[PDB]
Amino acid sequence: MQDAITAVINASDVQGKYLDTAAMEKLKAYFATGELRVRAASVISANAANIVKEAVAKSLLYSDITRPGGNMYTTRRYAACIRDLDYYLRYATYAMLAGDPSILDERVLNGLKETYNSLGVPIAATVQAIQAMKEVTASLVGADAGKEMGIYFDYICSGLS
Amino acid sequence: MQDAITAVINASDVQGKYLDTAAMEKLKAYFATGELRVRAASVISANAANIVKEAVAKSLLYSDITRPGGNMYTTRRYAACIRDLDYYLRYATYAMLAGDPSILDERVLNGLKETYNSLGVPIAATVQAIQAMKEVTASLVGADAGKEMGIYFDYICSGLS
Amino acid sequence: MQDAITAVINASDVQGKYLDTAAMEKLKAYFATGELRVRAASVISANAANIVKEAVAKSLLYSDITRPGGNMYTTRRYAACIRDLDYYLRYATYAMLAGDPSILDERVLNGLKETYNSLGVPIAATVQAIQAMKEVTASLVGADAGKEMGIYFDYICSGLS
Amino acid sequence: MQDAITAVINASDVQGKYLDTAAMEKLKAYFATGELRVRAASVISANAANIVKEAVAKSLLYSDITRPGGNMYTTRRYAACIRDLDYYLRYATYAMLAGDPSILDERVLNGLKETYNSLGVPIAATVQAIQAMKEVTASLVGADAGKEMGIYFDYICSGLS
Amino acid sequence: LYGLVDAIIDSQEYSEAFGEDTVPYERYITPQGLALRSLRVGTIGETGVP
Amino acid sequence: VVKASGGSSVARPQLYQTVPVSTIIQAEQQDRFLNRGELDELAVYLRSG
Amino acid sequence: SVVTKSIVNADAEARYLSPGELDRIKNFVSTGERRLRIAQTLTENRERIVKQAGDQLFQKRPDVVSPGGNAYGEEMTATCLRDLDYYLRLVTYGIVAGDVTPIEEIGLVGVREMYNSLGTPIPAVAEGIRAMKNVACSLLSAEDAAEAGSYFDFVIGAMQ
Amino acid sequence: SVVTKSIVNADAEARYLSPGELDRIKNFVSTGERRLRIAQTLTENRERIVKQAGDQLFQKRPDVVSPGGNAYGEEMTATCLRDLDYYLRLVTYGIVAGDVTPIEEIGLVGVREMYNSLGTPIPAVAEGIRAMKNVACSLLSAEDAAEAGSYFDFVIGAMQ
Amino acid sequence: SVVTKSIVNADAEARYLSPGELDRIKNFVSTGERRLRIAQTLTENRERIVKQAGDQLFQKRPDVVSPGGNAYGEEMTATCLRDLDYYLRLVTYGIVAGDVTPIEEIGLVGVREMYNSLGTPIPAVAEGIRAMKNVACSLLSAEDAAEAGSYFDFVIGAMQ
Amino acid sequence: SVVTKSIVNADAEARYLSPGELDRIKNFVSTGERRLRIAQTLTENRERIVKQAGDQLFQKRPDVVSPGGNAYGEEMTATCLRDLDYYLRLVTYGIVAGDVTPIEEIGLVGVREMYNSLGTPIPAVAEGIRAMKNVACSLLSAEDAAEAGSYFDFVIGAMQ
Amino acid sequence: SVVTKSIVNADAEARYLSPGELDRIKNFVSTGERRLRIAQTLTENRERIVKQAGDQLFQKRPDVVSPGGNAYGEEMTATCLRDLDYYLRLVTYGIVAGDVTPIEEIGLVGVREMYNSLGTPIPAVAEGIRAMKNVACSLLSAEDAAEAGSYFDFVIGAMQ
Amino acid sequence: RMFKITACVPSQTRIRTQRELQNTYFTKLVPYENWFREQQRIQKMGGKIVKVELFTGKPGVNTGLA
Amino acid sequence: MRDAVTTLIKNYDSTGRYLDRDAVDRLRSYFNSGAARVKAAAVINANAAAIVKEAASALFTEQPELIQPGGNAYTTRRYATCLRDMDYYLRYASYAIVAGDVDVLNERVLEGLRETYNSLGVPIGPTVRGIQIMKEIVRDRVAAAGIEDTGIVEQPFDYMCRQLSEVNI
Ligand SMILES: *[C@H](C)[C@H]1/C(=C/c2[nH]c(/C=C3N=C(/C=C4\NC(=O)C(CC)=C4C)C(C)=C\3CCC(=O)O)c(CCC(=O)O)c2C)NC(=O)[C@@H]1C
Ligand SMILES: *[C@H](C)[C@H]1/C(=C/c2[nH]c(/C=C3N=C(/C=C4\NC(=O)C(CC)=C4C)C(C)=C\3CCC(=O)O)c(CCC(=O)O)c2C)NC(=O)[C@@H]1C
Ligand SMILES: *[C@H](C)[C@H]1/C(=C/c2[nH]c(/C=C3N=C(/C=C4\NC(=O)C(CC)=C4C)C(C)=C\3CCC(=O)O)c(CCC(=O)O)c2C)NC(=O)[C@@H]1C
Ligand SMILES: *[C@H](C)[C@H]1/C(=C/c2[nH]c(/C=C3N=C(/C=C4\NC(=O)C(CC)=C4C)C(C)=C\3CCC(=O)O)c(CCC(=O)O)c2C)NC(=O)[C@@H]1C
Ligand SMILES: *[C@H](C)[C@H]1/C(=C/c2[nH]c(/C=C3N=C(/C=C4\NC(=O)C(CC)=C4C)C(C)=C\3CCC(=O)O)c(CCC(=O)O)c2C)NC(=O)[C@@H]1C
Ligand SMILES: *[C@H](C)[C@H]1/C(=C/c2[nH]c(/C=C3N=C(/C=C4\NC(=O)C(CC)=C4C)C(C)=C\3CCC(=O)O)c(CCC(=O)O)c2C)NC(=O)[C@@H]1C
């Protein structure tokens, strides 16, 4: 649970040094991008359900995954899958606000692959859906903030894979 | 492993459509920068050793990391650390040539957090070193190649984080 | 707990097709064996205490196990052992009614070896006592049900070993 | 592996300090214990098979472990168990010679608990067996080095637990 | 967290065991928790062989 | 009742070979920055295209 | 099945199946032949049931087939008709099982979440199943139709 | 930081960050330039702040430097001054972060436990931090000192 | 208000208001004039915003006014426009407050349940409020409209 | 150490320690006191050894300490002296261990890689350790000097 | 078994079972009835076979049951007879299977290790099994006894 | 808004030795949000609260009541 | 890898019991039906290629989406590997029909199959349907050949389908 500001100061703290000028430059960078990050976060908040719905339609619906015997087929499984996509999008938004994928590490990816492998969830199909969510999010929040959201979606994909 | 051409062709192939004009534009951009990519790659190959030397001197050297018990103390550990910086540079060069980050995800980032967390390697210090390598490399190869190589260095940095 | 009917309908559901005539044949078969299964379950329920009393007397009583230091010595441990024999009988009866070993797999045998090995319970003696219960049960419900109660009791013994 | 010498020097190396006078006292103590340790190692080396024989008799044999379905039943498994007990004896004697339990931690304990739980090996019986080995070894090598062997035998018990 | 906490504390099992007057207490352990406690030398005692 | 084998990690087999990937693949497996001649071969393709 | 629902609720209390539950299973297995016949008829007439019921649903609630609804165009309308087919199939499974357990686990758990995240009016789905119930009443004998109507009623009950 | 506290509350309530919390983050990122400037002045003058405030602490509380006091002798006094330096470093961190949680995480949680173990008197340490606040206020402008003083005030309040 | 929410939250922890919360209420005091100005201009255009945004809602979703839609008949169309007006009234309250505590309590908690009982589609309400957000942004000053859009975003996000 | 060397080899052969190896460690424990004495004298005179041998190194190769050399300037030349101090410390570790094992781990692995990338001439480093060996020989008795000479010799051979 | 040997070899080939392999296991299942009869004679007469084989063991090798021997004692001789019983049971398994691999899996893989641990003369165990073979051949016909001897003699050969 | 009510909860007959006086007569403070659960518990007990009061002065505010 | 005989032996050995009359009865049942099992496996082995081809065509007509560009069998590279999987199932199922026990299928085919299919992206539901289509074709062929009890031939395919499929309770 480190944001960019906390990460900068934490590294300084471990070294035992007052904030250096280079660290000030890194903090300035976070403050500089803050406005676009906050704006995109509010946009995702408003369109949260739609982002997930579009991603499911773009990557998962009318496919082997949702047709009978595909592990998203039963209604309980469909509800579970969209719940997980909601979880991914919410923590990606938190990560964009903070500037750090550490929240994704601690709250999503610390045991996710083992749970998915045990349950039988197809990792590749989830990765496809998360990638589609990246495309939809980029359109909704704008390309400039879309690059920022993209890195955190990629973090989820790298950990999940 | 996928280069940009492989990704474009495969996306078109899944859809079933012949290569569309927008896809042609993406491929055309990659081909157009081909001369710059090859030129920069040769520069990296020639200057790779000094790129690493400068980057280690910039951040890791004369630091707590090289102090006794700092995890680059031992001569073993120092040699391995500069090797890993060589790895990141080499695979960043591969990623630049291909134009896609799949090399980084397939070979560099499918065991990186496991290896580094198991060894105790300090991720923050590695991130600082790779950022320093990005700056040194950008100076040697010029701004256009500094931007391209920079995105792949950033990929490795965020993945390590 | 999947039974024969639930398993048949589930398999047809996975394929996606409505219930086939062949599936109807299988369901008719289970309905045919319903009379023996229900009758045997009623017999087991009424005589459950006597089944366990006879099995304990035949196999476990007046041995080292029931004498000081034998793991059935303490009054606590004796009551726990008879409770475990009741467990195996009850879930074997559930399995016979269902026509499916899924309940045994899911609830009874999962981690049974690990719990017993952690507690110090002799798994060899538990297997022998379950065999004694199998013989007593076979006598009480007759060869028709004893054949089936045999397969479910032996399922427990195979897993427990 | 770290023996006592290597542990002392590595502890000093981590701080970065030359070997202190207190560290010299530690090393001198190890050198003082050297004769009794080497003598005891030769005793165990010649009497290794007898130690395993006596221990398996004292604890493992004539129990539910060796009755059919008890995990040590079958000649394959009885051979395997005596092989594992000799593993413990050999590494424990290595540890007596070196003076540090790092051999046990590196070559025995790490991962053994998971493999044993996977294979179904009773873990209580293993602990009781190696404690029985401790009793036999104390008799053969004498009390003073039996004091020493016990430390490493107990280390193995704690790791398996 | 607040919803999950109230679900657990409002559950029928919290009222059945621990009631509404009793501090909660450890009522069960997984077998590899009993392995850690009860199989160290000094706690194993006789547990495992006659 | 069918216990699994390790854990399933997504595996990406190569559908087809291309000159970019092929040159980079062999360089990666021999652990050497793309040799000047091989780099020029990729450059032949890239100046073309 | 009625068997597993009896076993599950008895397992919770840690009892052997009580005599009343055993009697219930006895009756269910005896009348299983009748149940299989009921499901056979619905399976045979599945095409007609879906077609007639779909027309009735669209007529009663034209908004769904109007623009701006979930099912606009033949592509979306076909998928809606398939969903109605799904629920007919689940009702057949329910009749054969003798309990609502197949219906519940396969297709009544998370229905609100799935259809809400699909952009579909759940009350309209409920009316569609009501229409299928009426069609099924036509195609079944009175005593059988009452029993099958119970499973249709459970579907609409969770739906709305 | 404001961003991390907002995320923590939203995470514990399963809530996309509320508009008010987003507004708080917006104001904080804008004031960033002023925040970093205040931190730069404080760290540049850290030697003067610690020295002057340490003199004030010993003058106000002679018992701490009297025999039997915690900071008796040159080395003990040096460690006391180092603790004051630590707390100033924490205050600079807090000013930059815009939240007191970096100060709380590092050095303020369990401070009673740590100092009680060491034998140090907590209120006397609070006197030292109060003196540091006075010196920093002299080194800062009025608008700057009000913001930085609030972080000093939290430190003394928690260590009261 | 932000002050009221902050005071209650501090009361729970039995803490005097922390420096960050003091800063937040300080900024609320500072921006009060802009808050009142935003409320006044939106109030001036209160009828216009609701009516034209309602037209946009109907235009985007024809099923709303089609047969089977809840807003069928001139009286029901009036009720839908009134709901848009209710939310605008709450949004102006919330803008004045600087906190979503009024918006939440008055008109958002249980909105799914209330509209489900009424039969109304909450997603359609969401589209209507989105149209209101755009209209209000155009009438409001662009810099001020950025802050107001966040509060409209909260309302539409809660709708689902 | 001798003990670790024997145990590693025997562990690979899955064999209780061979009788000869047991005798070898017996001789090592008897010789340990002499080893500790040698380490004691070298570490007690460590400042002398490093200082005068470093002077010899710079005198023998002034280009190395000249401007443009790796040890150009006060800071860099001090760090070069520190490297000489490090290698003396590792030699003391090796003397106590009775085998190169500690020195061949802490240093002597990838020294070529580290130094060659660092820019330093590794033959010059070898000359520096040779000078330290000569000074140590003066400080040691003849037979004692032979063993310490062996460990220094291993270092210089690895350097070359 | 014959069936598993055929399947395993075919699977290693990665080819469907050969027609010749299928005919071989056709012969195996044809002779199954004879195999079962031979097994049942040995099983039902196991008490007599073990007792008479025990007499022959304890007279052909009187040392093993003499004082100081492995089997000396009322209980030690009982465990020895149990071991003979174990091997007879394995032989019946093998007679049913048509292959010696069930016998070899459950015993004869590590018998040397197990008995060397237990301090037993494995030649004496072999002579006990030979006594079992002699006793069993007379309880079977000459044609049947030749089959039984094969499974009794693989055991003895492995015992050496 | 927290509602405080005194309920002579009907005897559950769950006391052997032990003590049931504290359960038998209860004076408690209940949040208005949690008062529904309290009423359900009173139904299980069998005894309605003799006296019911609410600490907050006014029962309803349509807005910002909190 | 266990046959019916080896399985009965394994159970009885773990419990330390000489084979009683119940064991002999079940062993006799396997031996009596062994001739029919051999004939059925011979039919499958003889028509192995034809069964695979017919089952593949039936599966793709039932589920066109696989052959379309989105599906996993789209190009001929994957079409070949998919046909190979069909051949795998038939080969191991014929082994299981000879064996009379589904342990062969469990140990060599089904174990790890879901992990492998999820990682490679292979869709499991279509594969279950393909196995079922093989089951029906094979049952038709053995019934034509003259094997009266097709319970021996269908049960291995059914076990593969149940283990490979999810629960969908
Ligand atoms: C029909 C009464 C209403 C309606 C429906 C509609 N449905 C879809 C698409 C899907 N429906 C499902 C539902 C299920 N999956 C299941 O496994 C089960 C139980 C066995 C059910 C009920 C799913 C999974 C999909 C999508 C993926 C798929 O391929 O099945 C749509 C299309 C959604 C879209 O925008 O693409 C629609 C419109 N529409 C109506 O008007 C009725 C009120
Ligand atoms: C959706 C893109 C894919 C998919 C997923 C799917 N997941 C589940 C069930 C679970 N998912 C999780 C995941 C998480 N837990 C977390 O804490 C986090 C981080 C916030 C994540 C991502 C968990 C724990 C479960 C288990 C809950 C349970 O008991 O199921 C299912 C349900 C499986 C089932 O059988 O019910 C599904 C279907 N499925 C797909 O088809 C997509 C490709
Ligand atoms: C001296 C005889 C020669 C020489 C050396 C020189 N070294 C450095 C810098 C470093 N040397 C080390 C060496 C070690 N690190 C280790 O862990 C060990 C084993 C315990 C050794 C030997 C390291 C880490 C550094 C980097 C700085 C640091 O310690 O953090 C320098 C400075 C290089 C520079 O310009 O940056 C020099 C000059 N130089 C000579 O001229 C001699 C021939
Ligand atoms: C340097 C910036 C930091 C650092 C590094 C350090 N790394 C290691 C050891 C390993 N590094 C890797 C990583 C990779 N292996 C690869 O094949 C690739 C490319 C595909 C990478 C990135 C691995 C596997 C190891 C361990 C195996 C080995 O020794 O090579 C060490 C050694 C740790 C040890 O003592 O065992 C160190 C010290 N150290 C630092 O201080 C920097 C911050
Ligand atoms: C005597 C006062 C009454 C009575 C008793 C009776 N008991 C048994 C058999 C057993 N009793 C025990 C009891 C214990 N095991 C324990 O570990 C402890 C605490 C240390 C106790 C009290 C057990 C285990 C048995 C089983 C046999 C065995 O020990 O192996 C019998 C025999 C019953 C039978 O049919 O076998 C009897 C008769 N009988 C009376 O008439 C008195 C009222
Ligand atoms: C008898 C012909 C000879 C003989 C044997 C003897 N054996 C033992 C003790 C044991 N024997 C076994 C053997 C087996 N375990 C198995 O799993 C199998 C295959 C199914 C076999 C054959 C075991 C395990 C024991 C240990 C005790 C136990 O069963 O728990 C003894 C007793 C040894 C002792 O002193 O403890 C003897 C005497 N002795 C003879 O004289 C014959 C030549």
Author numbering:
A (entry chain aL), B (entry chain aN), C (entry chain aH), D (entry chain aP): 1 to 71, 75 to 150, 161 to 174
E (entry chain aM): 645 to 694
F (entry chain aM): 2 to 50
G (entry chain aG), H (entry chain aK), I (entry chain aE), J (entry chain aO), K (entry chain aQ): 3 to 72, 75 to 150, 161 to 174
L (entry chain aS): 2 to 67
M (entry chain aR): 1 to 169
Give me lines lifted from the publication on this model.
Cyanobacteria, glaucophytes, and rhodophytes utilize a large water-soluble, light-harvesting complex called phycobilisome (PBS) for solar energy absorption and energy transfer to photosynthetic membrane proteins (photosystem I and photosystem II; PSI and PSII). PBS is composed of phycobiliproteins (PBPs) such as phycoerythrin, phycoerythrocyanin, phycocyanin (PC), and allophycocyanin (APC). Oligomers of these α- and β-subunits interact with non-chromophorylated linker proteins to form PC rods in the whole PBS complex. Here, we report the structures of the pentacylindrical APC core and PC rod from the thermophilic cyanobacterium Thermosynechococcus vulcanus at the resolutions of 3.7 Å and 4.2 Å, respectively.
